[PDB]
Amino acid sequence: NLTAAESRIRDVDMAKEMSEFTKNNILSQASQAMLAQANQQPQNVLQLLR
Amino acid sequence: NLTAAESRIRDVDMAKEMSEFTKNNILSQASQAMLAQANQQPQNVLQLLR
Amino acid sequence: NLTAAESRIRDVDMAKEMSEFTKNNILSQASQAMLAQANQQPQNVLQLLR
Amino acid sequence: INHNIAALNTLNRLSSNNSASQKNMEKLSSGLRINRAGDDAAGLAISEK
Amino acid sequence: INHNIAALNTLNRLSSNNSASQKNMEKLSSGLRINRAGDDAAGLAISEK
Amino acid sequence: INHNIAALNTLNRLSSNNSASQKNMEKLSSGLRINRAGDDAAGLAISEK
Amino acid sequence: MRGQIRGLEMASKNSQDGISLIQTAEGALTETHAILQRVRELVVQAGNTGTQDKATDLQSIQDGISALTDEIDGISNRTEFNGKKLLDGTYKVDTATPANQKNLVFQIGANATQQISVNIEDMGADALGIKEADGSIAALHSVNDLDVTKFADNAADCADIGFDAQLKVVDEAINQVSSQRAKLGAVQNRLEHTINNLSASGE
Amino acid sequence: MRGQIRGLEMASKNSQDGISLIQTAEGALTETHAILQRVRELVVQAGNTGTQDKATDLQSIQDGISALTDEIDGISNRTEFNGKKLLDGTYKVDTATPANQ
Amino acid sequence: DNAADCADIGFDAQLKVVDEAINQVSSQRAKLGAVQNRLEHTINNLSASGE
Amino acid sequence: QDKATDLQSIQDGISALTDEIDGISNRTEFNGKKLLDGTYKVDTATPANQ
């Protein structure tokens, strides 16, 4: 019962944490794509206002 | 008769309980496969909306 | 009684130790999968910030 | 809404199923349909008596 | 204002997300929902005891 | 929580059952319902007398 | 929403912790109970086999029983959760005194006042709770084990040692374990259904 | 047009929010129901197994049931949406009184 | 000492402090964003009118 | 279930968070104007102090 109690403290919902891991990968990658786009827009500006 | 009475209280339908055990294994595994799929769909989304 | 005493000192809970063995295999493999992922993320970064 | 989807109802079923199979074992291993817990403390207290 | 635009809120989300996925791994790899850090030092000190 | 599950109640039943069958043998082999141990030292000390 | 979500995550945490406490005390009381089965075996033998056992035989038995007492007391004085002696029989003696209860509260709900009130009262000295411990009878047969030689004097004749009272102490001690575990498992079921709600509602 | 378009966007928003309320109360009532299944199990046992159970046994059961009551009340008094206790049984008792609905 | 018994520390008041603190942040940000929208539409007017 | 020390560990964390909130409200300046000075524009029902 005591190791179970500990296990509740250290309970990893491994499915949750893999899922959340997945999500955070997705979110990182998406945000970086948008950072690229943030660097693309002012180049378009550069040409258009040259 | 008394140990039989107790046995009725503690009656394990061992066949039932092995069967139900089996089922719950199946159900756990199936649900986890679906959790994987729940993590797969938004990745497809990530690519498709990149 | 004496060989039993020794046996208590050298008592292997063989079921425990097979179980713990199993667990430690699982844990090693999982951790290595995560090390792969640790090597995957910065590659995603490389492309995304190219 | 990618970051919000995890099929959390599936996850809830997962927790349920894991506890379910666990209970099955515990009864199988112990040979006890009775609970350790007071669930059906009537039948328990009877078998105690 | 080209030199002033970097979607810095996106960059902040980036830092956040990288640390987030990192934390997920660390717990996954270690099999520990508990933190190494004192965040929830209550639950930690309990499990220590 | 894979590293925390071993059906330890099953393991406890295992230890119990192994000792149980052991005791059965010991009595069967020796032909003694009496214990070597002082468990029921009343009946033992009687049979001694 | 997030305030409540996060509160439900910590609610699930707190309720699982509740369960850990429960099952700790539960298994301890199961072992206590198993002892009490052995005790009653030793009570029926401590019918002296009538008169056939001698005073020394009753003392051998009584040595075994006092040993068992020391084990029951060991249960009730070793079963701790986070230091809290969960089988401190004086933990939550209601007493009709609110000031002295240590109410085993479990705050679960993310909303205020959503608490569970639980009661601990069992221990080795807690056997026939007539109202409290009576004296040599009703509690201290569980502690002191009146079947020494006083039993051989009056195996039935006076109820106080006449086998009757002793067996009643054991029977009620068991019944108090039964009801303690009944409450305990009632709360177990509560937290089961609570968690199921916390999971679905949280989702 | 745009007035209606924008109103339809906020309409979709409001309806999805409706759904969120619904599914909240829904899952709560599903759990309530599951309890009630357990209750009826305890009713059939609280046939006393006829007469075989004793008064203490019925009290053990009743402790379990009152515990379940406290859980049902917990459902109906914890299921909130934006503070609105969605399973407040006195929320919309029609009453034949429009003033109190 | 009093996990619920007196409201002052009985978990109730504390959670209410947090809840209202949040609500005050919510309303502060509500005013703040109201003015944000104002200046959005202001600038749109200033731009069109200026033109 | 938590003990007094556990509540103190939590409280250490919370007082730390307080110090961070105070840090927000006492670092958020615009042109020196502590924009989250909670006493900046307390209406008070006193025009003189706003």
Residue numbers in the entry:
A (entry chain M), B (entry chain A), C (entry chain C): 255 to 304
D (entry chain A), E (entry chain M), F (entry chain J): 3 to 51
G (entry chain W): 52 to 254
H (entry chain g): 52 to 152
I (entry chain s): 204 to 254
J (entry chain s): 103 to 152
What does the paper say about this structure?
There are three parts to the flagellar structure: the trans-membrane basal body that functions as the motor, the connecting rod and hook, and the flagellar filament that acts like a helical propeller. Our current understanding of supercoiling in bacterial flagellar filaments, referred to as polymorphic switching, is based upon the notion that protofilaments within the flagellar filament can exist in two discrete states, that differ slightly in length. The “short” state results from a protofilament having a right-handed inclination (the R-state), while the “long” state results from a protofilament having a left-handed inclination (the L-state). To reconstruct filaments at high resolution, all protofilaments must be “locked” into the same state, either L- or R-type, producing straightened filaments that lead to non-motile bacteria.
While the three L-type mutants (E115G, S285P, and S17P) have a left-handed 11-start helix, the four R-type mutants (N226Y, A233V, H84R and A39VN133H) have a right-handed 11-start helix, and the designations L and R correspond to the hand of these 11-start helices. The L-type 11-start helices are tilted left by ~ 1.7° and the R-type 11-start helices are tilted right by ~ 3.9°. In R-type subunits of B. subtilis, the side chain of E115 in S0 forms two conserved hydrogen bonds with the side chain of N240 in subunit S+5. These two sites (E115G and N240) are mostly conserved among different bacterial species, and we also detected the same interaction in the R-type A443V mutant in P. aeruginosa. In the B. subtilis E115G mutant, the filaments lose this conserved R-type interaction and therefore formed a left-handed filament.
